[PDB]
């Protein structure tokens, strides 16, 4: 009864589409045309960071919003003082093909990973005056694409084997495997309460997962290409996706369908990194066209352009207090914008 | 500025010095990426992830990286490598190799990245050419069953498959068994790319 199972799946998909269409009764542009526009917000490079000698692929801000960690292609993980441009640490990595990096909320550990399929956890606070490898989490089959900390002992990772994983760092074991994607999972984002998380993949889809249950609650499919970036709204009840189709899309979790699309005819390039601002009003998206764009989340109008990078902007992040936006590109340079 | 901040700045300068000396030590290295369908293990010194093979030849250090669909997800990591060593079996499969070369030699990041193409298993192809005609996969040959002529024909649809043959160059070499021959061929190739880079840096070119 393979045809019967296919028909049942098609009927379930049709019922899901019918329920989603029944939920739609007013587009967000209709309820948002009344609010005032944000204007022409212009940000300047208040700081620049030099010292990387290859393409920068990842960065992560700290909870203190002053320490920064950046990963480059020369096998180098640098911890920077953003205020004074001083390099706190220069960790040499075993593998030089690092694609993601994370900073623990407590500030004691930094994670990295990439084509070696291993999530390396580095301890920063030691009795000796050096940074030591604390753990090497292994078990993923494909390349490690994104890692995010929940606490000092738990970390969630995404990979190219179409799965996401939860690790107890002390035991170093696969606590929970998250399954259901078809294409390569490219990015992760964690809810503010650290109980749910969303993953975007190359199958033009995003999935919401419970950390404590290991099951996929909702699947969102609006795009038409590989989703490269993902980020929750500061509310925690919505998220934003960016893909190679030069299109961002804001989904709401309770409405279970797409709420807004951000696109322009002049913008024809992939999207590498998407993050929000503190209030959620402002969305920042890095593109392949050597600069970043700044959209208004409640009305898809391109409010600003952050330009000054001589190569493709590969990563961008926003501080916890929202007073700085740091971008890293392939020109071996980091820039803090405000 | 505080005394602690001054000492922190001095520490940052020391990190700068270590970064500079590491760059000076590593600038004598050549970035090679090994791809194929099929004899990748016959060229290394003639779920894990990458395999790094480091070998030295005539004061050049070379690092080959084995990464053995959706290969475009991690292909941006090798967007600035010196050369791509591609492997292909004459006695192969052939359609898959042609498709892989389609994806590689016309890629966005590899428009100006040189290709060193190896046509390995020459004795196997010599034994197979007399037995099986060329019409098993390419029924357009209509030529002699000589091993040299068969190799020259199979070299096409690989070397003639590229586009924009004025910027990058594809090198062809049947895989020999005289030890220090293939490494010398790769040495000559990377010497050519290094000469081009030096010309561009000096700006006269």
């Amino acid at each position, epitope marked *: 009864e393979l045809d019967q199972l296919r028909q049942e799946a098609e009927q379930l998909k049709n019922q899901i589409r019918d329920a989603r269409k029944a939920c739609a009764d007013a587009t967000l542009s209709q309820i948002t045309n009344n609010i005032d526009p944000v204007g022409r917000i212009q940000m300047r490079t208040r700081r620049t960071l030099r010292g990387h000698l290859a393409k920068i692929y990842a960065m992560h801000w700290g909870t203190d919003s002053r320490l920064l960690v950046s990963a480059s292609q020369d096998g180098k993980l640098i911890i920077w003082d953003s205020y004074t441009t001083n390099k706190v640490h220069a960790i040499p990595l075993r593998s030089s093909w690092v694609m993601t990096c994370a900073y623990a909320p407590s500030g004691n550990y930094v994670a990295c990973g990439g084509l070696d399929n291993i999530c390396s956890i580095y301890n920063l606070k030691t009795r*000796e005056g050096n940074v030591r490898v604390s753990r090497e989490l292994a078990g993923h089959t494909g390349y490690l694409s994104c890692c995010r900390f929940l606490d000092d002992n738990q970390i969630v990772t995404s990979s190219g084997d179409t799965t996401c994983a939860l690790w107890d760092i002390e035991t170093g074991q696969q606590t929970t495997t998250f399954t259901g994607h078809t294409g390569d999972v490219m990015s992760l984002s964690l809810a503010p309460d650290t109980r749910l998380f969303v993953s975007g993949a190359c199958d033009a889809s995003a999935k919401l997962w419970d950390v404590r249950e290991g099951m996929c609650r909702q699947t969102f499919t609006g795009h038409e290409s590989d989703i490269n970036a993902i980020c929750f709204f500061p509310n925690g009840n919505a998220f934003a996706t960016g893909s190679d189709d030069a299109t961002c899309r804001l989904f709401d979790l309770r409405a279970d369908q797409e709420l807004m699309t951000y696109s322009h005819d002049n913008i024809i390039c992939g999207i590498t990194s998407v993050s929000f601002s503190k209030s959620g009003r402002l969305l920042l998206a890095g593109y392949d066209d050597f600069n970043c764009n700044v959209w208004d989340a409640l009305k898809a109008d391109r409010a600003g352009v952050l330009a000054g990078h001589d190569n493709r902007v590969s990563c961008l992040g926003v501080t916890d207090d929202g007073m700085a936006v740091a971008t890293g590109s392939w020109d071996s340079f980091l820039k803090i914008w405000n | 500025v505080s*005394a*602690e901040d001054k000492a922190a700045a001095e520490r940052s300068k020391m990190i700068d010095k270590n970064l500079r000396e590491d760059a000076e030590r590593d600038a004598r290295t050549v970035k090679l990426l090994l791809l194929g369908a099929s004899g990748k293990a016959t060229i290394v010194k003639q779920t894990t992830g990458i395999i790094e093979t480091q070998f030295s030849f005539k004061d050049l250090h070379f690092r080959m990286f084995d990464v053995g669909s959706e290969r475009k997800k991690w292909i941006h990591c090798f967007e600035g490598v010196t050369c791509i060593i591609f492997c292909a079996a004459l006695s192969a499969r052939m359609h898959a190799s042609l498709k892989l070369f389609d994806s590689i030699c016309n890629h966005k990041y590899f428009s100006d990245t040189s290709i060193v193409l190896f046509l390995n298993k020459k004795d196997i192809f010599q034994e197979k050419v007399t037995k099986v005609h060329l019409s098993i996969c390419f029924p357009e040959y209509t030529g002699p069953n000589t091993f040299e002529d068969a190799g020259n024909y199979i070299k096409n649809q690989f070397l003639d498959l590229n586009l924009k043959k004025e910027d990058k160059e594809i090198y062809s070499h049947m895989t020999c068994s005289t030890d220090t021959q293939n490494v010398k061929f790769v040495f000559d190739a990377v010497t050519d790319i290094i000469i081009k880079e030096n010309l561009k840096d000096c700006g006269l070119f």
Partner: single-chain antibody
Amino acid sequence: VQLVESGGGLVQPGGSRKLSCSASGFAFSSFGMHWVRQAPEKGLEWVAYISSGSGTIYYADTVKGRFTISRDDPKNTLFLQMTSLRSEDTAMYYCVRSIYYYGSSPFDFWGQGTTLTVSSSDIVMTQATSSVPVTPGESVSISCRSSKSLLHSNGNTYLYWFLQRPGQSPQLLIYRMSNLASGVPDRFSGSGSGTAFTLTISRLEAEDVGVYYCMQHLEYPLTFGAGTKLEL
């Protein structure tokens, strides 16, 4: 982590001696290294400092022109060469490590020290109280005063607290105020501003008896204060 000092002994006035200190258990090359001094019945006094990589060298005014500080990083050793000794140099010498960045813990480990006997402007740190009685289980407040405000423009206040137990090398409790050092129980707290400074012990035990020393790290020559002795 071990800093074992060697040298010392009886030297006639006008003589010379070399003190060595061997470091074993940490990255010696990444730590700035200090020489500190205690007179036999008096408090602490800074002598010298050598940076990581020997880029910056600093001396006290008294030991200037007579004392040389150096390090051998491959040998993991620190050296102090003393020439033209006077009778005011009869003291015990400690060797201290200090790594420097915002959020680090300078002066966090101290050596055992060696005894030298000889025959025959600056921020003043004042601790007026001395030899105050304590009762176990109670709360003790220790005051500390300065001459210049130690609050810098970057928000950092450079007051360091140390504990010299009877017959033991000084420890570190607080490096910047409200920053508690590693290995210290959560009953020590530090609070102050500008000139005034306070250390609070909520519930002291039998292992918290000794002499409490202040230090300023705003500017050299890193003056200490005459400590407060706790007595049961």
